[PDB]
């Protein structure tokens, strides 16, 4: 290293002294590199106790001991035995102070991080694991996730580093709920880390899927961030990656791709068809290149997917699995609609004594019959009477999709009962006000479910009225959206007060998803849910695009 | 600050005896003014040093001066020290006049005092009757010696071979303290 460096400095450093002390707030490394490389050569020579300790600094003597504007911190510590003064004086994690009450906003990249990259490798990486090894007893003291996640060159040079980090965090699923560290980086990885290498994103998808499978998540009912991250991951690679990536996930559907999230799989395979559509990956062959995706189809078809049954089959340029589409038995042979309606009525009747047996009634709850019982409630002026609300908020959100499966058709029937408008206004004034209390469903599965079993030949032209009037009505939060839009484009990566900004924001309108709104005879809140909450409605910001596509492009027929 | 200027004159008188003196006096050449011979660059740090070489008057129809060492970067010095060729009045006076001029230019350029030294190594005990007749200066051996002793406080060391001719007794005429006499057989000294 010294030969070429000296040969180049003999021609570049043609001067008489060491001028230009170069305070240089914005750009100081460009001028101080000549002295930093010299100090590194000095340390390398002193390590061997030879080479005259790299002599001849006279042309740079003024910049030599320049150590004695926060941007003047020339980090010349990479050699050895200097990682205390420059690095230690930096704005590290919070230790003094302690809920989103964390002080000390983070650092900007172009200010200091433009140079201190090859020096900061395993400082924060070991700091976080040391904080996480024992337990996250108190609320998370640091908020350095902004700086850590907004490190693109970090993952450019050490993409395997975050993989190792996640693998070492994996044992925490036994430590404590895998909560204090999973909800730490998973959010900002989806929101701040937009552009990343895909050959690792597929592995991260597999890890997310086996995470959603194992371990349990009944206490992690706020795991909607997991599904949002999965959607962001499977919705961004649709350009050209799946075809070269097939060799990576050849066995992934054969082992783990179909655990519970069938709607996630539906969106995944929709994006897969969209990707095979770019560009013309099927006009050439029909069965030769068929096996490229037929394996995935055969693995998925064990879980009644692609329920569209010739109505929504429009995005596939050559619909192959649509040949075996009759295997979906939508709405259970078109007769079980009224039968499950009568069953819901009988369950609403047996609610008179389901209280003492609610523990033995919630066990799998007859999956697509239980949680729709809330519908009869709020039709009798808050007829819930907190009999099993705490029990209702336990495991119901998983089977709520199977519950609303036939209830989409039942609500289409309630809507068509108008036949002129006599029931229309009653439905508008009752249903829209009763659905809001209380849920966080946020149409996360109704858009997919509408094409599953309601858009079929039963009332297709009438179930298409759903998107016309069912979810067109929600307008409760559009008032604060107009002010929430001006936070990320005005500050792409110019954030200096994002912590308190989003803290006040989520302190104003929202409270939580576990929390209730009615204070009835007894309500023990028991809040533990404060791991990290930087983003709340950017999750639906993406799923708005599948809605935008099922409403126009996918359902282009009507 | 290690501002030296060598003066090689025994290139033609005693060729093979050059290595015998080098193997013993190479340490004061580098190991004293530096850490040791390495692969490094040079600058205005003042550590630079020169080396003038001369030959006898018989093998010199036109070529007399070959003082070629501006800086030498503390390593190329010993590099070309073994590269010079090896070819009675050996014209020591005109050979020292150019060293005096080189020291004058040093003092004129080194303004912002480095304990200068010089080795008038001469194998034979020669003597140059004509003063210079080849440069700007014009002064006999005695005049040049008293000028180099009085003006410059340089340690006028005379590293001659193991011989002890009458040259030392006359060339020790440095009146200020310059250590012109020593012909060091024992272990190397700093500058004397």
Curated annotation (Swiss-Prot), chain A:
It is found in: Nucleus. Component of the Mediator complex, a coactivator involved in the regulated transcription of nearly all RNA polymerase II-dependent genes. Mediator functions as a bridge to convey information from gene-specific regulatory proteins to the basal RNA polymerase II transcription machinery. Mediator is recruited to promoters by direct interactions with regulatory proteins and serves as a scaffold for the assembly of a functional pre-initiation complex with RNA polymerase II and the general transcription factors. Component of the Mediator complex, which is composed of MED1, MED4, MED6, MED7, MED8, MED9, MED10, MED11, MED12, MED13, MED13L, MED14, MED15, MED16, MED17, MED18, MED19, MED20, MED21, MED22, MED23, MED24, MED25, MED26, MED27, MED29, MED30, MED31, CCNC, CDK8 and CDC2L6/CDK11. The MED12, MED13, CCNC and CDK8 subunits form a distinct module termed the CDK8 module. Mediator containing the CDK8 module is less active than Mediator lacking this module in supporting transcriptional activation. Belongs to the Mediator complex subunit 23 family. This is Mediator of RNA polymerase II transcription subunit 23. It comes from Mus musculus (Mouse). The lineage of its organism: Eukaryota, Metazoa, Chordata, Craniata, Vertebrata.
UniProtKB/Swiss-Prot annotation, chain B:
It is found in: Nucleus. It comes from the Eukaryota. Belongs to the Mediator complex subunit 25 family. Component of the Mediator complex, which is composed of MED1, MED4, MED6, MED7, MED8, MED9, MED10, MED11, MED12, MED13, MED13L, MED14, MED15, MED16, MED17, MED18, MED19, MED20, MED21, MED22, MED23, MED24, MED25, MED26, MED27, MED29, MED30, MED31, CCNC, CDK8 and CDC2L6/CDK11. The MED12, MED13, CCNC and CDK8 subunits form a distinct module termed the CDK8 module. Mediator containing the CDK8 module is less active than Mediator lacking this module in supporting transcriptional activation. Component of the Mediator complex, a coactivator involved in the regulated transcription of nearly all RNA polymerase II-dependent genes. Mediator functions as a bridge to convey information from gene-specific regulatory proteins to the basal RNA polymerase II transcription machinery. Mediator is recruited to promoters by direct interactions with regulatory proteins and serves as a scaffold for the assembly of a functional preinitiation complex with RNA polymerase II and the general transcription factors. Required for RARA/RXRA-mediated transcription. This is Mediator of RNA polymerase II transcription subunit 25. Residues 1-192 are annotated as: Interaction with the Mediator complex. The gene is Med25. The chain holds residues 15 to 216 of 745 of the full protein.
């Amino acid at each position: 290293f010294l030969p070429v460096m000296k040969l180049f400095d003999l021609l570049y450093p043609e001067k008489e002294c060491i001028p230009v002390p170069d305070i240089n707030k914005p750009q100081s490394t460009h001028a101080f590199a000549m002295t930093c490389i010299w100090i590194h050569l000095n340390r390398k020579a002193q390590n061997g106790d030879s080479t005259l300790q790299i002599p001849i600094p006279h042309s740079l003597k003024l910049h030599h001991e320049f150590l004695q504007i926060a941007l003047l911190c020339n980090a010349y510590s990479t050699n050895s035995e200097c990682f205390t003064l420059p690095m230690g004086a930096l704005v590290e994690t919070i230790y003094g102070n302690g809920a989103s009450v964390t002080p000390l906003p983070m650092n900007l990249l172009d200010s200091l991080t433009v140079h201190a990259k090859m020096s900061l490798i395993h400082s924060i990486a070991t700091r976080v694991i040391k904080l996480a090894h024992t337990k996250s007893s108190v609320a998370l003291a640091p908020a350095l996730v902004e700086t850590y996640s907004r490190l693109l060159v970090y993952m450019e040079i050490e993409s395997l580093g975050i993989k190792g980090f996640i693998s070492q965090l994996l044992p925490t699923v036994f430590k404590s709920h895998a909560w204090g560290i999973l909800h730490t980086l998973l959010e900002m990885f989806s929101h701040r880390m937009h552009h990343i290498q895909p050959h690792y994103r597929v592995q991260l998808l597999s890890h997310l899927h086996t995470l959603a499978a194992v371990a349990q998540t009944n206490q992690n009912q706020l795991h909607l961030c997991v599904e949002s991250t999965a959607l962001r991951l499977i919705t961004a690679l649709g350009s050209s990656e799946v075809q070269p990536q097939f060799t990576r996930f050849l066995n992934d559907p054969k082992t783990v791709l179909s655990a519970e999230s069938e709607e996630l799989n539906r969106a995944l395979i929709l994006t897969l068809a969209r990707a095979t559509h770019v560009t013309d990956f099927f006009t050439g062959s029909d069965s030769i290149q068929g096996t490229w995706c037929k394996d995935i189809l055969q693995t998925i078809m064990n879980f009644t997917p692609h329920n569209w049954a010739s109505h929504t089959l429009s995005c596939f340029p050559a619909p192959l699995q649509a040949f075996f589409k009759q295997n979906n038995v939508p709405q259970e042979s078109r007769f079980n609609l009224k039968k499950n309606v009568e069953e819901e009525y009988r369950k609403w009747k047996s609610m008179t004594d389901e209280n003492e047996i609610i523990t033995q009634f919630s066990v799998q709850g007859f999956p697509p019959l239980f949680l729709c019982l809330l519908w009869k409630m709020l039709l009798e002026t808050d007829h819930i009477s907190q009999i099993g609300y705490k029990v209702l908020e336990r495991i119901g959100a998983r089977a709520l999709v199977a519950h609303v499966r036939t209830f989409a058709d039942f609500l289409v029937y309630e809507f068509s009962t108008s036949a002129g408008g006599q029931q229309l206004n009653k439905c508008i004034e009752i249903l829209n006000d009763m659905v809001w209390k209380y849920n966080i469903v946020t149409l996360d599965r109704l858009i997919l479910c509408l094409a599953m079993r309601s858009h079929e030949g039963n009332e297709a032209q009438v179930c298409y009225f759903i998107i016309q009037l069912l979810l067109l009505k929600p307008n409760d939060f559009r008032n604060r959206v107009s002010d929430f839009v001006k936070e990320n484009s005005p500050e792409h990566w110019l954030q200096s007060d994002w912590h308190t900004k989003h803290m006040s924001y989520h302190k104003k309108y929202p409270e939580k998803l576990y929390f209730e709104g009615l204070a009835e005879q007894v309500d023990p809140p028991v809040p533990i849910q404060s791991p990290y909450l930087p983003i709340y409605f950017g999750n639906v910001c993406l799923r708005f695009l599948p809605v935008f596509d099922i409403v126009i492009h996918r359902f282009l027929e009507l | 600050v290690a501002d030296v200027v060598f003066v090689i004159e025994g290139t033609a008188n005693l060729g093979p005896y050059f290595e015998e003196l080098r193997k013993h006096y190479l340490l004061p050449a580098i190991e004293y003014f530096n850490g040791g011979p390495p692969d490094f660059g040079g600058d205005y740090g003042g550590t630079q040093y020169s080396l003038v070489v001369f030959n006898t008057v018989d093998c010199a129809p036109e070529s007399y001066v070959q003082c070629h060492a501006p800086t030498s970067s503390a390593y190329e010095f010993v590099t070309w020290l073994d590269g010079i060729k090896f070819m009675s009045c050996s014209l020591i006076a005109e050979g020292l006049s150019t060293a005096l001029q080189l020291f004058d230019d040093f003092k004129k350029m080194r303004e912002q005092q480095t304990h200068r030294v010089c080795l008038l190594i001469c194998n034979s005990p020669p003597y140059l009757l004509p003063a210079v007749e080849s440069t700007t200066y014009s002064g006999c051996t005695t005049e040049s010696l008293v000028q180099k002793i009085g003006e410059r406080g340089i340690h006028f060391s005379i590293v001659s071979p193991r011989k002890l001719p009458a040259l030392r007794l006359l060339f020790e005429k440095a009146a200020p303290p310059a250590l012109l006499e020593p012909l060091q057989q024992p272990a190397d000294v700093s500058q004397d």
